[PDB]
Amino acid sequence: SGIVPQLQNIVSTVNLGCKLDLKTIALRARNAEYNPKRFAAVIMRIREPRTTALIFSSGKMVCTGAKSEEQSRLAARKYARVVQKLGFPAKFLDFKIQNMVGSCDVKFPIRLEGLVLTHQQFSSYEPELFPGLIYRMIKPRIVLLIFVSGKVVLTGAKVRAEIYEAFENIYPILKGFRK
Amino acid sequence: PGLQTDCEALLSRFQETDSVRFEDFTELWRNMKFGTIFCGRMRNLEKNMFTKEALALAWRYFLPPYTFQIRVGALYLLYGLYNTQLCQPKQKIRVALKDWDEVLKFQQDLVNAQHFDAAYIFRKLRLDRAFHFTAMPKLLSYKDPSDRVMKLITSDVLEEMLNVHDHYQNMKHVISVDKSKPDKALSLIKDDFFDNIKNIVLEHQQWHKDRKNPS
Amino acid sequence: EDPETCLQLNMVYQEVIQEKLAEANLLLAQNREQQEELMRDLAGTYMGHFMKPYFKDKVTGVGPPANED
Amino acid sequence: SRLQELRKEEETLLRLKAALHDQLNRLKVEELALQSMISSRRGDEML
Amino acid sequence: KAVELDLVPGRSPISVAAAAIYMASQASAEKRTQKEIGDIAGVADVTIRQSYRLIYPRAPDLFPTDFKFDTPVDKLPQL
């Protein structure tokens, strides 16, 4: 191939293993937000890993927005220490990735119609809903948004190797439809 | 207010005669009676405003890509207009810096091309100092085309092509051992390439013809 | 008699045809410059945006602070 | 109108350039052939 | 022709059709505004303007050869 996909977003989760009050955390945390009338969770953003953590009463946290597995883990540990400091018995249970969005460009405009006619069993291209084609790869379960400018947005992964495999699989298929 | 129409009418009447003789222009002036184009009740402001506009019109007509006949006609037009005004300050012609650099070689060609009528007209219009040499054309706040095809393919161009083509034919006839066996790797040149260029230029010209031809 | 004449004749032919490309490519560059000028004309302030607060901001609409004068 | 005149002239000169570039490519192929043949022929009197 | 020439890549087919109808409408006696075409086509007049602006440069090429232009292709509406 020759083009490696740049990760853009990584949703991971972690279990604190202790119930929390969202009022307490929200009133006593620095960059927290909590409007239960709109969503029952505390949205805590931090700058260095540049991440957004949603924290739930049950003790489960989801850290999104980090662009690396290690970086996501570090942001999760930061939020864990934050909650621990606010007076709760925070713990670090089953930190597990749940999504990894990758994005890359192939540097040539593609003909969609050819692709959708070639792989009608996979692609769901409707330009009056979403102007990109949606190729649902099956061998790795990864959804690829392909656009007329060549931008490919892979999503749904659970590890970086999966995005790499999926993009390498999808590369020649697109090479075949270079406008 | 319609002055562009009469100016274009004079330009067309002149380019149809295919003349560079200022005598034909003088006759077209006397017939179309441009001695009146300014005549009429105007106080002073409409007068010099319309004179400015007419001079600017004639000048922009003078410039490329307009035809040489049209250009000489617009030059004679500028001459007649500027030399025929009613305002005491004879409005000047707005001449740019970019357009002056080409009017220079145009005047030079007019001298070279033995068109001494237009050359003398231009030397006169410079002598009486009818030019306001501006920076950008007119002011600033806030067609008869020249085909590139003929610049690319001429009768002289195709003639030279065919001369060198027949020369190369007669020469490749001799340079080999014989005159009747061209090698397979030495027969690739098209003998109709000249004909192909003629076909392309003629199909373009007939496209333009049917473009002006209504239906 | 000898290809050397072929060599020199082909050199001169290539020279003339390359001069032809030089002129033609200059014409192409001029035409593309004209096209770029036309595009920027399509992509080309009103003298209203330069009234009393002549120095308006881009992140805001307010001008500069008042002057000691 | 000027835009269409300019673009058609652009296509005209592109086609002329394409034809002449084919001409130069084949001319240079002929030039390489000439170089090889002259090398081979001049090698016959160096013996 | 516009789709084949790829003058509107990624555009919705309805947006291309509305722009084409506007182009054809403006080149004939029966002239329809962008709002009129958008209402039937279900396309905002801005979208018709954008798609039309992409195919306007090559208007003479797109039109059928045997089309009687009530308004000449050169004088097509400015947008």
UniProtKB/Swiss-Prot annotation, chain A:
GO terms for cellular component: chromatin; cytosol; euchromatin; female germ cell nucleus; female pronucleus; male germ cell nucleus; male pronucleus; nucleoplasm. Sequence repeats lie at residues 7-83, 97-174. The keyword DNA-binding applies. DNA binds at residues 9, 45, 60, 99, 136. GO terms for biological process: DNA-templated transcription initiation; mRNA transcription by RNA polymerase II; positive regulation of transcription initiation by RNA polymerase II; RNA polymerase II preinitiation complex assembly; spermatogenesis; transcription by RNA polymerase II; transcription by RNA polymerase III; transcription initiation at RNA polymerase II promoter. Its main location: nucleus. Signal peptide: none annotated. Keywords: Disease variant, DNA-binding, Host-virus interaction, Neurodegeneration, Nucleus, Repeat, Spinocerebellar ataxia, Transcription, Transcription regulation. Widely expressed, with levels highest in the testis and ovary. One of its GO terms (molecular function) is RNA polymerase II general transcription initiation factor activity. It is found in: Nucleus. Belongs to the TBP family. This is TATA-box-binding protein. The chain holds residues 159 to 337 of 339 of the full protein.
Curated annotation (Swiss-Prot), chain B:
GO terms for molecular function: RNA polymerase II general transcription initiation factor activity; RNA polymerase III general transcription initiation factor activity; sequence-specific DNA binding. GO terms for cellular component: nucleolus; nucleoplasm; snRNA-activating protein complex. Keywords: DNA-binding, Nucleus, Phosphoprotein, Transcription, Transcription regulation. GO terms for biological process: snRNA transcription by RNA polymerase II; snRNA transcription by RNA polymerase III. It is found in: Nucleus. Residues 1-149 are annotated as: SNAPC3-binding. It comes from the Eukaryota. Residues 145-215 are annotated as: SNAPC4-binding. The keyword Electron transport does not apply. Its main location: nucleus. Part of the SNAPc complex required for the transcription of both RNA polymerase II and III small-nuclear RNA genes. Binds to the proximal sequence element (PSE), a non-TATA-box basal promoter element common to these 2 types of genes. Recruits TBP and BRF2 to the U6 snRNA TATA box. Part of the SNAPc complex composed of 5 subunits: SNAPC1, SNAPC2, SNAPC3, SNAPC4 and SNAPC5. SNAPC1 interacts with SNAPC3, SNAPC4 and TBP. This is snRNA-activating protein complex subunit 1. It comes from Homo sapiens. The lineage of its organism: Eukaryota, Metazoa, Chordata, Craniata, Vertebrata. The chain holds residues 5 to 234 of 368 of the full protein.
From Swiss-Prot, chain C:
Residues 4-44 are annotated as: SNAPC5-binding. Coiled coil: none annotated. It is found in: Nucleus. It comes from the Eukaryota. It is linked to Neurodevelopmental disorder with motor regression, progressive spastic paraplegia, and oromotor dysfunction: An autosomal recessive disorder characterized by delayed motor development and developmental regression after the first year of life, followed by progressive spasticity with gait alterations, paraparesis, and oromotor dysfunction. Most individuals have cerebral, cerebellar, or basal ganglia volume loss. Part of the SNAPc complex composed of 5 subunits: SNAPC1, SNAPC2, SNAPC3, SNAPC4 and SNAPC5. SNAPC4 interacts with SNAPC1, SNAPC2, SNAPC5, BRF2 and TBP. Part of the SNAPc complex required for the transcription of both RNA polymerase II and III small-nuclear RNA genes. Binds to the proximal sequence element (PSE), a non-TATA-box basal promoter element common to these 2 types of genes. Recruits TBP and BRF2 to the U6 snRNA TATA box. This is snRNA-activating protein complex subunit 4. The lineage of its organism: Eukaryota, Metazoa, Chordata, Craniata, Vertebrata. The gene is SNAPC4. The chain holds residues 81 to 164 of 1469 of the full protein.
From Swiss-Prot, chain D:
It is found in: Nucleus. GO terms for biological process: snRNA transcription by RNA polymerase II; snRNA transcription by RNA polymerase III; transcription initiation at RNA polymerase III promoter. The keyword Transcription applies. Changing residue 16 to A: Minimal effect on SNAPC4 binding in the absence of SNAPC1. Reduced SNAPC4 binding in the presence of SNAPC1. GO terms for cellular component: nuclear body; nucleolus; nucleoplasm; nucleus. One of its GO terms (molecular function) is RNA polymerase II general transcription initiation factor activity. Keywords: Nucleus, Phosphoprotein, Transcription, Transcription regulation. It comes from the Eukaryota. Part of the SNAPc complex composed of 5 subunits: SNAPC1, SNAPC2, SNAPC3, SNAPC4 and SNAPC5. SNAPC5 interacts with SNAPC4. Part of the SNAPc complex required for the transcription of both RNA polymerase II and III small-nuclear RNA genes. Binds to the proximal sequence element (PSE), a non-TATA-box basal promoter element common to these 2 types of genes. Recruits TBP and BRF2 to the U6 snRNA TATA box. This is snRNA-activating protein complex subunit 5. The gene is SNAPC5. The chain holds residues 3 to 49 of 98 of the full protein.
